[PDB]
Amino acid sequence: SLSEYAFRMSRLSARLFGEVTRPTNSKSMKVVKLFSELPLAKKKETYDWYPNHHTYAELMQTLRFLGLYRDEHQDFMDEQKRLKKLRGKEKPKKGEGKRA
Amino acid sequence: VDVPKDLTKPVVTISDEPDILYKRLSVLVKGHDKAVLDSYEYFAVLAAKELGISIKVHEPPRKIERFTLLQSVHIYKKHRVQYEMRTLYRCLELEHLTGSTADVYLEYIQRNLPEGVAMEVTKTQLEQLPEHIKEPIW
Amino acid sequence: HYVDWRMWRDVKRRKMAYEYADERLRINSLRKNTILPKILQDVADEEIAALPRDSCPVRIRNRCVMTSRPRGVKRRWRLSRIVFRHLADHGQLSGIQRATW
Amino acid sequence: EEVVIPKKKTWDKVAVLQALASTVNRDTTAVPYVFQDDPYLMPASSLESRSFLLAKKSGENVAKFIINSYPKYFQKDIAEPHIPCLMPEYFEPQIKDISEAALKERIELRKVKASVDMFDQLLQAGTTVSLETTNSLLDLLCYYGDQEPSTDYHQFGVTWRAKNNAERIFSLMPEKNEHSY
Amino acid sequence: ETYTEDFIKKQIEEFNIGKRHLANMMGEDPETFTQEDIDRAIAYLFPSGLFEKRARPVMKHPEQIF
Amino acid sequence: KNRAARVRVSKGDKPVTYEEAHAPHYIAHRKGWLSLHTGNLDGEDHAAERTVEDVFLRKFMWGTFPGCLADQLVLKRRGNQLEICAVVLRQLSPHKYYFLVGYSETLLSYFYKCPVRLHLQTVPSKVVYKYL
Amino acid sequence: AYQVHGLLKTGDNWKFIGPDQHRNFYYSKFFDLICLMEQIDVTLKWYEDLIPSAYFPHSQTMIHLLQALDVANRLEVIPKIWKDSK
């Protein structure tokens, strides 16, 4: 319990310092908190968590087609792909496959 | 024998508004190497003496942050690798500076902050009472 | 070009959740108090339950950004323990060493 | 007793740097700073001194050529504050509507072929072209002699031609002010 | 490990020459630059926190090294 | 038996560099960090974004100077600047090295929106610390 | 020539020396004149300052430095001049 003077004083301080002045229960003070920060989804760590993998692969792919980047991994996989084709183990054409 | 002539000096315009006063100006620096913080202390304390600033230095105690990880890709829960990150400190306590002295000195020591070193510059500025607080409105 | 389809499904979840965050915030605020009438809060319940399911932020998963692993990720680096260690053990993470004491 | 509070000196954002550069004179043991400082990359003749700087500049054109040819790979601003000069450049007019404002783009973008083609269509529409707008279009056509400035990738004799478009445009121009002449 | 006597003498030469450059950088008298001044200067110019001292940068007389 | 970043002993004939010759329990003891920034210091931010940048650059440089690098990159950051300190070999034309320095620097500065420099240090052959 | 060079080195005047062609021409001529009309000791001072710090010589300007060394009867330096020539 708080005296009327103690009560009317803490309400005056709250008005001054910009805190809630109406009596508000703890369940409704979430409204203040909700608008007092950013939504989790809006925070940079969240929406910008992943590197743009579309940009890192597409950039380094043209840099290889341009001759300015050597992709030892893609060279490896091309060689294997070339050999499998010789063995006859080539990818079938989509749709026009063995089955109907 | 080819020494240049008429060395052009930068324009330092003395203005007519007064200058900020800093009661003190604490400069904490944080690195992973202590020898690097020793060389940065030597540099910054000398730079302050060659500029007529009063400077004191102490070492705040270090922080060692450790965490554990699994050592294997799949099972073997009893086997861990543990890692740490040490943060070492040195606080440069400068005192009684004017805004322009600070401005020059910070810029200088900040541009020569070594790789892997961070700095937190607390500036305690001196100020006088706002006009509206001189006398009540009652 | 993401590591896999599970990462790709999280990339989309994170993006949709960002698009709707302001709407979701506003609707929650209505239904997160005792001030407003319940007939109104009940409408809000319906409204936010009708927003696309992939805008719900609890459906975001913090996967290794390099290998897409859904567990064992350190949040400061967004990497799985396998990937973190590989860089840490080669000396490639600034200031991170093996701990002994 | 009274605080003798001094006055705030001010300077430019390069001044302290310049104050520090004053303290150093060039190094005689070193080649110019634009070169790499390795015993094996240090130029060892005037020919190399020239050739090595062209190679470095050649690689920069290839970079700038890629950066401007694939803008999407370089449209993610991480810098604070924003650096306008490390962004890609866009040289194609983005407004296809026939309007006075759209004319300025082709003029500002020094696109001689786009401007004349748009000017022809615009003239057929019968819309009025401002004198200032027409004057600016003339400067571009005359300055380069109706020859498109070549950029990235897609002498002896008289280069001027009597049957050139610049001459024709003046005839079509209804009003010719002093700047036109 | 094959360090010919000639090899060492070329090392002592380089140390003496380097000793003088080090005193010059540090703004000290080349004629009174002791080893303890070499160590203090090298520690400042190449700061390393490596916990092992034998792994840190060093500039010693070739006879104390080889 | 531990495996991480250990080069095994073999038959006394394997050239290894000082970097390769040291196991992870020597990373603050007998050798340093191949990168230096402030992200992993107490109270600092963006350790993740620094780490993704460092994984790309090492990959970028390895394929951009194919067969030239003689050791690992040293990545440095000072404020807004980024320094790439490579040790390369002396087999490529210095014309080609200058092309690649100018190219990489430019391309990386527009990609990571910062001033990026690249300091080469040529060696004749890969510096051998030990024959494992 | 010392007045011409003296002017270039004042303030920010050195920025007017122009492209590489202009720069070699300037320093090539300037130094030829030094070797011919200057004391040998001061020619060696200008030799060390200008090359390769500011100017990569031409084949000729080595000859002039040789001749100036002969006129000064300082042949103990010719060895050094050969190394630099390479």
Next chain:
Amino acid sequence: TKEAPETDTSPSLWDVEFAKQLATVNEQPLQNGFEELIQWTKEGKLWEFPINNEAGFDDDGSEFHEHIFLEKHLESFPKQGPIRHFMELVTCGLSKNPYLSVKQKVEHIEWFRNYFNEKKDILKESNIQFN
């Protein structure tokens, strides 16, 4: 010189092209490291020291009282009742949010204004007059 210049008139191609080659006069290769830091600072590539963590951010030139005092925007809402109570919590929280611009804050407030304006009937049934 001429008393009154043609300030309204703007430079032409000839003008700027001449300005470009007036600069080519003094352009020389960078001489040392200081010159590159100086060149980069002029180009805006390098940070300016001593650093301000808000260098480049002026926050739409807003003043403190536009973030902190948001009741002026509640003038279209009921002056009393549950809507006032509620909106007084939105603005209290908004007035404490250092991550939003004043424009973003006003968007939140304006949403609730449009939102409660659509639920008039719901609000009228519960005897809360909106307008």
Next chain:
Amino acid sequence: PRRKALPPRTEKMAVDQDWPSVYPVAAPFKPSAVPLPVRMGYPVKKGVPMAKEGNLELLKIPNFLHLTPVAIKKHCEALKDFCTEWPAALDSDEKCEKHFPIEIDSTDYVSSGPSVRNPRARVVVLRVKLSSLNLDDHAKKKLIKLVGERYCKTTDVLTIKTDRCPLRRQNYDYAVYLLTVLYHESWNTEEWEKSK
């Protein structure tokens, strides 16, 4: 043939040169440009630390070759021009807080990366003693009842920390605004205060 590397220029360096010209700014250790026979590396058994050339250990040091004592003194001479003088009247901290009762704290955060932003920079702290203000008994009581724990009785300092606003500018302005309206309200005597 195969291009041969020139000799290091450390040989052409004079033992008395001015070293600041060689390394004017912060730059990575170059063996070919540093005339020191410095070795680094944990030695193999019956071996020596490794030579400077190709030594990746020396390239991992953030060196101080651009900041020798010579260089520093030279630098600071050119910078004395930029700095102004401390008011000789403000000798002691006693005199500082006599003439300047308010103190404003703020922090700047220097960190490496592409972005300079740091949300901790916005915070402003306003510190003042209540003995430096024009407060009677009445008002000194109400000011202390209004600020709560922002006031320390031991030191008599009232501390106002503000961080509501995006900018430090705006927060400082708010901190002053608060000290102001706190001072004027502590002087106003509402009628309900007779219920104490």
